[PDB]
Fold this sequence. Notes:
Chain A is an alpha+beta fold. The first copy, chain A, is 18% helix and 8% strand. The radius of gyration of chain A is 11 Å and the shape is globular.
Amino acid sequence: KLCLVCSDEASGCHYGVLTCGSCKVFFKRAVEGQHNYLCAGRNDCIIDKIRRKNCPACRYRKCLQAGMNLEA
Amino acid sequence: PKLCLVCSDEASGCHYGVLTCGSCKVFFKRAVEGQHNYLCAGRNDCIIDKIRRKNCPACRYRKCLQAGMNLEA
DNA sequence: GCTCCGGAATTTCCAA
DNA sequence: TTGGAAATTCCGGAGC
Ligand SMILES: [Zn+2]
Ligand SMILES: [Zn+2]
Ligand SMILES: [Zn+2]
Ligand SMILES: [Zn+2]
């Protein structure tokens, strides 16, 4: 039932991956925002429920290598 | 010149005992009266600057305390 | 007249 | 939206 990104509960499978609501209003506007997103860490930041908003960079990263894309 | 000891932006003036910008001033003020409960998603060495400073409240708050910031000064 | 600082009130911002 | 946190702006009072 877990979002494969933030490990909150999934609202369904969107963009080819099972994840949550916020994680699926997030990928989302990073792509056609085509955003910068610099990490203040090592690029290995932990992504979970209340930390997910700390590092958009690592969050966006983890989105991609879970396979999220705009296509179907 | 004139540059903040915390978020590394240009300093409004000495605030709470530490030369700092205005952003960190009201950040620190808000942190001490409220809760600290912030978590770091990194190793607690996170880099703080104008773009990065909003990423990790935890590390930013730590730097303020490290800098010597205190409410009565 | 000014400088300096705390700080409240206001606006900007964005996540959920 | 609905509400919380960020940040710029502005005012009160101690000084000088
Ligand atoms: Zn998620
Ligand atoms: Zn990161
Ligand atoms: Zn600062
Ligand atoms: Zn951190």
